[PDB]
Amino acid sequence: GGPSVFLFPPKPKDTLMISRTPEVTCVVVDVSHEDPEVKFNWYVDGVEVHNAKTKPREEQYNSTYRVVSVLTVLHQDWLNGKEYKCKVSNKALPAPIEKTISKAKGQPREPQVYTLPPSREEMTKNQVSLTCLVKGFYPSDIAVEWESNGQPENNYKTTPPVLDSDGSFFLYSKLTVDKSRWQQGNVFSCSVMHEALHNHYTQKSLSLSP
Amino acid sequence: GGPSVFLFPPKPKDTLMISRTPEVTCVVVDVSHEDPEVKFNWYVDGVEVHNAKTKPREEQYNSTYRVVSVLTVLHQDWLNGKEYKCKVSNKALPAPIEKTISKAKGQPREPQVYTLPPSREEMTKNQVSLTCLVKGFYPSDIAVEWESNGQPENNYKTTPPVLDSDGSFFLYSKLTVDKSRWQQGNVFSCSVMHEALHNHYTQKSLSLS
Ligand SMILES: *[C@@H]1O[C@H](CO[C@H]2O[C@@H](C)[C@@H](O)[C@@H](O)[C@@H]2O)[C@@H](O[C@@H]2O[C@H](CO)[C@@H](O[C@@H]3O[C@H](CO[C@H]4O[C@H](CO)[C@@H](O)[C@H](O)[C@@H]4O[C@@H]4O[C@H](CO)[C@@H](O[C@@H]5O[C@H](CO)[C@H](O)[C@H](O)[C@H]5O)[C@H](O)[C@H]4NC(C)=O)[C@@H](O)[C@H](O[C@H]4O[C@H](CO)[C@@H](O)[C@H](O)[C@@H]4O[C@@H]4O[C@H](CO)[C@@H](O)[C@H](O)[C@H]4NC(C)=O)[C@@H]3O)[C@H](O)[C@H]2NC(C)=O)[C@H](O)[C@H]1NC(C)=O
Ligand SMILES: *[C@@H]1O[C@H](CO[C@H]2O[C@@H](C)[C@@H](O)[C@@H](O)[C@@H]2O)[C@@H](O[C@@H]2O[C@H](CO)[C@@H](O[C@@H]3O[C@H](CO[C@H]4O[C@H](CO)[C@@H](O)[C@H](O)[C@@H]4O[C@@H]4O[C@H](CO)[C@@H](O[C@@H]5O[C@H](CO)[C@H](O)[C@H](O)[C@H]5O)[C@H](O)[C@H]4NC(C)=O)[C@@H](O)[C@H](O[C@H]4O[C@H](CO)[C@@H](O)[C@H](O)[C@@H]4O[C@@H]4O[C@H](CO)[C@@H](O)[C@H](O)[C@H]4NC(C)=O)[C@@H]3O)[C@H](O)[C@H]2NC(C)=O)[C@H](O)[C@H]1NC(C)=O
């Protein structure tokens, strides 16, 4: 049919905290039933390391399969822009398909975090909007979360990174809360994880004036 | 590789202003010399229509032809859900290729437009940012703009639309200006164009106070 490959980068959060594990997925689509014999081969700066592991395919319920491999990586490795090449061999595919990825190039720029109170003209509604504006950062790989009293709030959405005119990125994070718990003077905070921050983590709190 | 067809919708602003001309564009690529002929058939909710406008072939440096057909649509036909289908036929295709576009099926929701003054903390750079918050709208087709004193303020960026948890949409627009204005009580206004806003427009002013 049409076995094409797709290489994906690790998650931003995973390369910043050594607690978690950053990976490179090498998803191969449209695998034929006939010859489902797909092989993999990794290269770290064309050095070919060994440690990756494969997975059990699935049925794309459209007469095709979908194999996918994943290779673990060192946090500093990936951060220092090394290359990750994933070659997808095959016994029934024209030739050796390949793809490579690495982190965006350029000097990391430190994000500037600001929290914004909900507009008074929203006080009427039953729920208000807490706003976290993260701008001026490079590269765009970033993570955002909101919390309260150490506990993690989950009713929020974050717009993806947007290229600014100066070449850095920005985004907004919106947290939704019952108007009541905002007048009570509760405290909410925006957390931003990024390689350019000291200790890869910054936090700016948001609360009511009186 | 046989011909490929891509269907494009009109621009959001185009469908909200009776003065604009909303168009749906059917583009065809990868048409070799062996069979350069292409036929276009248009359907509006299934009934074939013939008011299109098809431009003639156009070579593409890669030895393949590109053909494009344009269909003008009525503002209300669009805002009302009508579906447009483009059938492309090529003497080298097993079967004709068809594509269909429309306004996302749903029920329009009026967008909430709030403005936000900059954070006191950011008040330390030669530039500041005024925020425009637009939430609770559907469908996601929208348009945002900033202007101060009638004139258009061009140094801004709008985030793309983000699906909220209630199913509606929201976005943020950022207007970056010199703190050497904001401090001088200047007034900035954020305008939004959407199908669910009376007269398809609304405006919110942000001022220093
Ligand atoms: C049969 O059915 C198949 C499967 O069906 C599914 O899909 C539809 C058909 C749907 O209707 C359902 O039926 C069903 O859901 C179907 O396969 C599909 O084929 C498509 C065509 O090839 C594939 O499209 C590609 O998608 C890429 C993006 O993939 C991500 O996003 C999709 C959509 O959300 C998602 O489905 C994928 O899973 C994938 O998500 C990411 O996945 C990785 C790996 O798991 C995650 O990362 C890991 O996560 C773990 C978590 O534990 C951990 O954190 C690890 O650290 C981490 O690594 C991510 O989290 C996850 N992210 C997200 C957001 O979800 C596209 O990139 C790709 O686009 C490129 O190629 C296009 C042409 O092919 C081109 O037009 C396009 O422009 C683009 O090209 C690139 O452009 C860039 C800039 O724009 C440039 O920078 C590049 O240079 C340039 N490159 C190239 C080569 O051009 C492409 O569109 C689709 O993914 C695939 N679906 C599935 C489910 O596999 C098949 O087509 C059907 N067959 C037939 C005949 O119909
Ligand atoms: C041979 O050469 C051909 C010519 O290419 C030349 O390009 C030059 C730039 C240069 O590189 C030359 O050297 C080169 O020769 C080449 O043709 C190209 O083929 C590509 C495919 O291989 C086409 O790619 C598709 O592009 C789509 C978007 O195209 C628009 O945006 C690009 C910029 O990124 C622009 O270049 C295009 O021309 C096009 O512009 C839009 O045009 C429309 C109509 O003209 C405008 O609309 C009108 O605008 C006016 C304003 O005056 C007015 O407002 C009207 O009202 C309005 O209607 C748009 O404004 C304009 N947009 C912009 C930004 O300018 C992609 O969407 C498409 O991706 C889709 O398909 C992929 C699969 O391949 C898939 O991976 C991807 O996810 C996506 O799928 C869609 O996903 C959606 C979900 O998000 C779904 O909703 C959709 O249903 C789903 N669709 C499908 C089908 O699945 C794809 O990447 C490329 O456009 C084309 N180039 C041109 C100029 O047409 C050819 O390939 C070459 N062949 C070979 C063998 O080399």
Whole-angstrom distance, CA of residue A170 vs CA of residue A161? 6
Residue A157, min C-alpha distance to chain B (Å):
7
Residue B205 to residues A101, A124, B13, B176: CA-CA distances in angstroms?
45, 18, 21, 15
CA distance A45 to A64: 32
Ligand 1 centroid to residue A68 C-alpha, Å: 12
Pair A110, A154 in one domain: yes
Q: Which amino acid is at B16?
A: L
Q: Domain check: are B118 and B196 in the same one?
A: yes
- Helix H or strand E encompassing B144: strand B143-148
* Deposited experimental method: X-ray
Are A77 and A164 in a shared domain? no
Is residue B133 within 8 A of residue A119, CB to CB? The reply is: yes
Q: Which of A16, A25, A140, A163 to mutate to test the pocket of ligand 1 (most atoms within 8 A of CB)?
A: A25
What would the DSSP string read from start to end of A90-139? -SSSSS-B--EE-PPPS--B--EEEEEPPPGGGTSSSEEEEEEEEEEEBS
Tell me the sheet residues that pair with A135: A112
Nearest to B172 among A164, A172, A176 (CB): A172
Q: Where on the phi/psi map is residue B18: left (φ > 0), alpha (ψ -120 to 50), or beta? A: alpha
Last residue of a domain, one of B102, B134, B160: B102
Residues in chain B closer than 8 A to A131 (CB atoms): 116, 131, 133, 172
Determine whether the shortest distance from the Cβ of A10 to ligand 1 is under 6 A: yes
Q: What total number of domains does chain B contain?
A: 2
Q: d(Cα B209, Cα B206) in Å, to the nearest integer? A: 9
Q: Are strands B38-44 and B97-101 parallel, antiparallel or unpaired?
A: unpaired
Let me know whether A138 and A68 are in one domain: no
Question: Could you tell me the residue range of the domain that residue B167 belongs to?
Answer: 103-208
A184 with A155, same domain: the answer is yes
Contact yes or no for B67/B55 (Cβ under 8 A):
yes
Q: Which residues are registered as beta bridge partners of A145?
A: A191
Look at residues A84, A102, A120 and tell me which one is the last residue of a structural domain: A102
Position B43: which residue type? Answer: Y
Same domain, B74 and B24: yes
Question: Tokens for B99?
Answer: 């594509």
Q: Are A158 and A107 in contact (CB under 8 A)?
A: no
Domain end marker among A102, A126, A150:
A102
Strands A23-25 and A70-72: antiparallel
Per-residue CA distances from B155 to A134, A165, B99, B125, B175 (Å): 17, 8, 37, 16, 6
Ligand 1 centre to CA of A51 (Å) is 24
Specify whether A93 is located in the same domain as A107. Answer: no
Which of A119, A122, A162 faces B157 most closely, judged by CB atoms? A162
Per DSSP bridges, beta strands B84-90 and B38-44 are: antiparallel
Task: Report helix, strand or coil for B16.
Answer: helix
Q: Let me know whether B89 and B13 are in one domain.
A: yes
Q: Is the peptide bond before B22 cis (omega within 30 degrees of 0)?
A: no
- 3-class SS of residue B182: helix
Which residues on neighbouring strands pair with residue B138, listed in sequence order?
A: B109
Same-domain status, A204 and A107 = yes
**Facing residue for B174 by CB, picked from A115, A121, A170:** A170
User: Is the CB of B30 inside a 6 Å radius of any atom of ligand 2?
Assistant: yes
Residue A89 to residue A182: CA distance in whole angstroms: 57
Determine if the peptide bond prior to B118 is cis (ω within 30°): no
Question: Which of A45, A117, A41 lies closest to A81, judged by CA?
Answer: A45
DSSP chain A: ----B--B---HHHHH-TTS--EEE--B--B-SS------EEEESS------B-----B-SSS-B----EEE--HHHHHTT--EEEEB--SSSSS-B--EE-PPPS--B--EEEEEPPPGGGTSSSEEEEEEEEEEEBSS--EEEEEETTEE---EEEPPPEE-TTS-EEEEEEEEEETHHHHS--EEEEEEE-TTSGGGEEEEEEE---
Chain A within 8 Å of B179 (Cβ-Cβ)? no
Residue B201 DSSP class: -
Report the gap between the CA of A172 and the closest CA in chain B (Å): 7
- Angle subtended at Cα A12 by Cα A8 and Cα A18, rounded to the nearest 5 degrees: 110
Q: How far apart are alpha carbons A57 and A69 in whole angstroms? A: 10
> A115 to chain B, minimum CA–CA distance in Å?
7
Q: Which long-range contacts (CB under 8 A, 24 or more apart) does A53-58 make?
A: A57/A31
Residue ranges in B45-84 assigned as alpha helix (H): 75-79
Region label for A209, one of left (φ > 0), alpha (ψ between -120 and 50) or beta (otherwise)? alpha
In this structure, the answer to whether residues A130 and A73 fall within a common structural domain is: no
Please tell me whether residue B166 adopts helix, strand or coil conformation.
coil
DSSP state, residue B20: S
Look up the CATH number of the domain holding residue A23.
Answer: 2.60.40.10
Are residues A69 and A16 part of one domain?
Answer: yes
Residues A150 and A56 in one domain: no
Enter the resolution in angstroms. 2.5
